């Protein structure tokens, strides 16, 4: 169950009963740049800190981002999280990511390269994401 | 970077042994196989009894064959271009730790292939699953 | 270039009426439907009783719905972006005989769609079937 | 006798009086433009319409453009597969069937026009990573 919704600049987060946060929406009209440096934590109205463990379903859908850092607090990237981000060319994934859900980078056709962290256990076939993604690299543990 | 020293036939498998001391699986001949499961040998012996590791699955080695399953042994470092392409009955692929490279379209248009597990040793993949309809999910082996 | 005159609800269907005298189907609400077959009306009546043709299936109108089949009536000229995307039970699509354009990803990631018949009137399609990997064959009436 | 060579083109001639283009040999071609002949003649001067582009006929060749003449009824499986420089395909007009992966990995192909005669084809969006739009001629 959602405990509260917190807005941090262009980011909307939902805080759950289990003490984790999901990044539910990126609002490009509120962003200071096209590089999304996603925070690893979010603080509620009472000063309690929660880790950002999930990039929610369609959170960045159809946004103008050119680059993104997914912090090491994130365990899962949701379905269509970065779908139709037509200018997205630089994706930094971090060691602790376990799951990359279906079509997480659907039609990110400016994405030419991606490196998968050693921690990833299950992902959607990454070659479905971008028409320009010829090769996928895997980080060694 | 090398030259073929000898060609060896082991049942349905053709191997080329290179002067660098490694062997490439160049062809799978269906008509000589005992079953549709390809249990690829990790090594091949030449006419003088010398043993060589099978380090590469050659380009198109299993192209359009009737295989239902395959074990790629721990001796293999790379899987060549279209090595298992258009294998419409292939549903079970065992990759082993030591594989580094999966070349372009290596498992292309394999319509019965629904999943694959990638070993922790794999460093690079050139779109090996293009046109393989049911290949949604990729699992990754931990170290 | 037009403006929305009014919005009309007809069972599970939401329509926008434009000043050019046409209607766009903007949303399909699963919870208001009597069945999983979407028999889209060819016309819609506004609050003053005026009938208008349904000429467009709007962007994402049926996105992620439970529909198993759809009839796109002969009044429809264009199917919008992602109009039927992610409809994983959709297997039967009857398209409009006046359909001219099928916009980008209109039938994307529809994993149960195995075939489609394209009407002779269609002039242009912007990759409508991306990620619908069971969609092998496309039929046309021909000569 | 049942095989005819016309420059870079090999044709197999059938009992039913039709011909299949079985192979394109780029080392024998005068250019990278494959203007496929609509007919082929045997040693006795009998003319055979070219009705089929055979399976893998142009596989991995250097062609930059192709005209498939109005005599062709079917394009075979992987006929133009891995033709990495192919950017212009003219289909004519009598074509009925386009078999599986006829233009597989023809990733320099940005648009294609499908003739009104085509009745059944492999999804053309599978062929090229650069093919955003398919046009249908009336
Ligand atoms: Mg197939
Ligand atoms: Mg790994
Ligand atoms: Mg799917």
What are the extents of the domains in chain D?
Answer: 1-138
CATH superfamily of D1-138: Ribonuclease Inhibitor (3.80.10.10)
* Contact flag A121-B140 (C-beta cutoff 8 Å): yes
B64 is in an annotated binding site: no
User: Residue B130: how many CA atoms within 13 Å on its side-chain side?
Assistant: 28
CA distance A107 to chain D (A): 11
**Pick among C59, C81, C109, C132 to test the A interface (most A CBs inside 10 A):** C109
Q: What is the resolution of this structure in A?
A: 2.0
Instruction: Please tell me the experimental approach by which this structure was elucidated.
Output: X-ray
3 state SS of D28:
helix
Read off φ and ψ for residue B32, nearest 5 degrees: -105, 0
Chains that touch C (3 or more CB pairs under 8 A): A, B, D
Question: Does the domain formed by C1-142 have CATH 3.20.10.10?
Answer: no
Q: What count of other Cβ atoms lies within 10 Å of the Cβ of residue D84?
A: 14
Dig out the tokens for D55 from the structure: 């399976």
- Rounded alpha-carbon distances, angstroms, from residue A113 to A88, B122, D130: 11, 16, 17
Written as six digits, the tokens of A98 are: 């376990």
Q: What is the CATH number of domain A1-140?
A: 3.80.10.10
> Which of B103, B125, B128, B131 is most worth mutating to test chain A (most A CB atoms within 10 A of its CB)?
B125
Rounded to whole angstroms, the Cα distance separating C93 from C115 reads 9
Long-range Cβ contact pairs of C37-40 (< 8 A, separation 24 or more): C37/C67, C37/C68, C37/C69, C37/C70, C37/C71, C38/C12, C38/C62, C38/C67, C38/C69, C38/C70, C38/C71, C39/C70, C39/C71, C40/C13, C40/C70, C40/C71, C40/C72, C40/C73, C40/C76
Collect all residues of chain B within an 8 Å Cβ-Cβ radius of residue A136: 124-125
- Alpha-carbon distance of A53 to A21, in angstroms, equals 6
């Amino acid at each position: 169950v959602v405990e509260s919704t917190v807005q941090v600049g262009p980011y909307t987060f939902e805080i759950w009963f289990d003490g984790t946060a999901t990044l539910t929406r990126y609002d490009e009209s509120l962003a200071g740049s096209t590089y999304a440096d996603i925070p690893a934590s979010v603080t509620d109205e009472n000063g309690q800190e929660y880790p950002v463990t999930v990039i929610g379903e369609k959170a960045f859908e159809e946004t103008n981002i050119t680059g993104v850092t997914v912090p090491d607090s994130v365990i899962s990237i949701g379905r269509l999280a970065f779908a139709y981000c037509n200018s997205l060319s630089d994706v930094k994934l971090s060691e602790n990511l376990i799951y990359i859900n279906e079509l997480a980078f659907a039609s990110c056709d400016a994405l030419k390269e991606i490196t998968i962290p050693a921690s990833v256990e299950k992902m959607d076939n990454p070659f479905r994401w971008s028409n320009a993604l010829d090769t996928v690299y895997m980080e060694g543990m």
